[PDB]
C-alpha cells in the first residue's frame, strides 16, 4: 500500500509544475500535504514536464491548469452538484485539459466552491487572487447573512 501511494504521488508530481511558491493554495494543498506525508521524499523525473495554458473561467475562479492533476473532481462537481455542465476533461493522455472547450465563464453560481473541491491550486479564487496565505488567516466559524439559507 505504501509503495503504491508513493508511486502515484510521484506520477502526480511528475508533470506537475513547481508552482507551489506562486500557487495561491500553497499551504492548504492536498498534493503538498500528501507528498509531505505519504509520497516519496525525492522525484526521479528530470525531463520536460507538460504545461497547459490558463483557461478563462470568469472573474471568480483563477485557473492555472498546468498545476491541475486532472483528477476530474471539478468536472464532476459542475456536472452534478452545481448542475450547470460547463467544465469538461477535453482530450486524452497527459494532454488532458480541464475546463470549458469554448471560452465560457462559469455562469453558474455555486461554482466558486470548485476551489474548495479542487485538491490542487489550479482552480483558485480570483478575488482572493494572492492576497494571503493558508497560515496567516485566522479563522472564525461565523455564519452567513447574504441569503436566508444561513
Amino acid at each position: 500500500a505504501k509503495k503504491a501511494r508513493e508511486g502515484v504521488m510521484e506520477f502526480l508530481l511528475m508533470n506537475h509544475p513547481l508552482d507551489c511558491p506562486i500557487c495561491d493554495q500553497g499551504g492548504e494543498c492536498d498534493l503538498q500535504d500528501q507528498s509531505m506525508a505519504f509520497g516519496s521524499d525525492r522525484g526521479r523525473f528530470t525531463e520536460m514536464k507538460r504545461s497547459v495554458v490558463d483557461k478563462n473561467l470568469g472573474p471568480l475562479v483563477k485557473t492555472v491548469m498546468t498545476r491541475c492533476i486532472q483528477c476530474t473532481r471539478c468536472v464532476r462537481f459542475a456536472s452534478e452538484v452545481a448542475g450547470v455542465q460547463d467544465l469538461g476533461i477535453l482530450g486524452r493522455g497527459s494532454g488532458e485539459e480541464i475546463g470549458t472547450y469554448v471560452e465560457k465563464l462559469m455562469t453558474s453560481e455555486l461554482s466558486g466552491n470548485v476551489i474548495d473541491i479542487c485538491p490542487v491550486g489550479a482552480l483558485t479564487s480570483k478575488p482572493f487572487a494572492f492576497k494571503a496565505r493558508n497560515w496567516e488567516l485566522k479563522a472564525t466559524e461565523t455564519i452567513d447573512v447574504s441569503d436566508a439559507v444561513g
Binding site: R42, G43, R44, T46
Partner: protein, 71 residues
C-alpha cells in the same frame, strides 16, 4: 534529479558523481602540537642568586669605594 545537478560528462552510472567538497589533503595535515612546551632554559636557582650575591659582593665594595672618594 541529483544526477542533473552533479553532471560530470559521461560517467555511465549514478555512482562516480563528482563529489568535490572540502577536507584534509591526501595524507592529512601536519602533526599538530597540543602539549605544553614551556622551555625552562633560563638562569637556574644558582647563577641567579650568585649573580645577585656577586653583584652585592662587588657592587657594595664599589659603594664603599665611592663613599671613600666622596669623603
Amino acid at each position: 534529479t541529483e544526477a542533473m545537478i552533479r553532471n560530470k560528462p559521461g560517467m555511465a552510472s549514478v555512482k562516480d558523481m563528482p563529489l568535490l567538497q572540502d577536507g584534509p589533503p591526501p595524507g592529512g595535515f601536519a602533526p599538530v602540537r597540543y602539549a605544553r612546551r614551556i622551555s625552562n632554559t633560563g638562569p637556574s636557582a644558582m647563577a641567579m642568586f650568585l649573580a645577585v650575591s656577586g653583584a652585592f659582593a662587588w657592587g657594595m665594595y664599589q659603594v664603599g669605594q665611592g663613599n671613600k672618594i666622596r669623603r
